[PDB]
Amino acid sequence: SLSAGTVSGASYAWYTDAGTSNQFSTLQNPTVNNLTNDSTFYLLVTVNGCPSALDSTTVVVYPLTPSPSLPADFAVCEGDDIALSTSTVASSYDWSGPNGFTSNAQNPVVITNATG
């Protein structure tokens, strides 16, 4: 989302191109869809008929979270235990698997009696 302060008597216009061309919205607080990298927008405000100086904004885009690191494909004998874990640090973990296995942990509860 983009934003602009409220000015009495003002109309608003946003542009995607400095030089005041390629208008994109005449709302005060328009949205931006599908950002994949850093991008800029230009706000030009006009009160009583006079345009303001152009005021640019930059929308900063956060990098891709890299894939979680897991053990290579392993192999247990029936009766042994399946100990899953990940080496990466996160705010939240979400695991799922066979037999309804579900967990929220860096180191999930170990399955103590492996079976088919």
Partner: peptide, 22 residues
């Protein structure tokens, strides 16, 4: 002699799931 206004910016409430309202 009035004056033609700009285009109140038209839009909608995002993508809509087939079969529902918008």
């Amino acid at each position: 002699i009035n004056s033609i206004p700009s285009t109140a910016s038209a839009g909608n409430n995002g993508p809509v799931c087939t079969g529902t309202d918008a």
